[PDB]
């Protein structure tokens, strides 16, 4: 479980928007730049920038 450090607005069809403070479950971290995540706060799924979140 990770927490969002900053708001992120999705710019494409596979990334996930989230608000600062949202809690997320990381599903796929094979790549170092983009992680597939699942929002525990909102239940939505998509790719997020890995440097927008921190473990919590």
Author numbering: 85 to 140
Which statements did the authors publish about this structure?
The Src homology 3 (SH3) domain is a ∼60-residue modular domain that consists of two antiparallel β-sheets orthogonally packed to form a single hydrophobic core. This domain is present in many proteins and regulates critical cellular pathways by recognizing polyproline-rich motifs (PRMs; Kurochkina & Guha, 2013). Three-dimensional domain swapping (3D-DS) is a mechanism by which some proteins can oligomerize by exchanging identical domains or structural elements between monomers. In previous work, the 3D-DS of the c-Src SH3 domain has been characterized and its dependence on experimental conditions has been described. This work explores the role of the hinge-loop composition by interchanging residues in the RT and n-Src loops between two SH3 domains: one being the c-Src SH3 domain, where 3D-DS has been described, and the other being the Abl SH3 domain, where 3D-DS has not been described to date.
